[PDB]
């Protein structure tokens, strides 16, 4: 009866917190470097465009 | 056949030893018929004849 506020109500950056297993979902901090390696079948020749 | 009003553009090119370039040529022809294509520059080789 004195816990206060769980982390899903206090944590910054709009964090969302769950348990079993404990997780911090959808933090808004930083940037995600996404590297994509795509095959040549996907492309289309410039003349074909 | 005689050809007039010829314009040439290179949508994309690459010196990759395997015909890495393409050229598009617009033309106006007097009549239908086969025509010889020849590159007057040793530095550039054209696949089509």
UniProtKB/TrEMBL annotation, chain A:
Localization (cell): Host Golgi apparatus, Host trans-Golgi network; Host cell membrane; Host cytoplasm; Host endoplasmic reticulum
Superkingdom of the organism of origin: Viruses
Disulphide bridges, residue numbers: 15-27
Known partners and oligomeric status: Homodimer. Homomultimer. Interacts with host karyopherin KPNA4; this interaction allows the nuclear import of the viral capsid protein. Interacts with spike glycoprotein E2. Interacts with host IRAK1; the interaction leads to inhibition of IRAK1-dependent signaling. The precursor of protein E3/E2 and E1 form a heterodimer shortly after synthesis.
Function: Provides the signal sequence for the translocation of the precursor of protein E3/E2 to the host endoplasmic reticulum. Furin-cleaved E3 remains associated with spike glycoprotein E1 and mediates pH protection of the latter during the transport via the secretory pathway. After virion release from the host cell, the assembly protein E3 is gradually released in the extracellular space.
Protein's recorded name: Structural polyprotein
Shown residues within the full chain: 1054 to 1102 of 1248
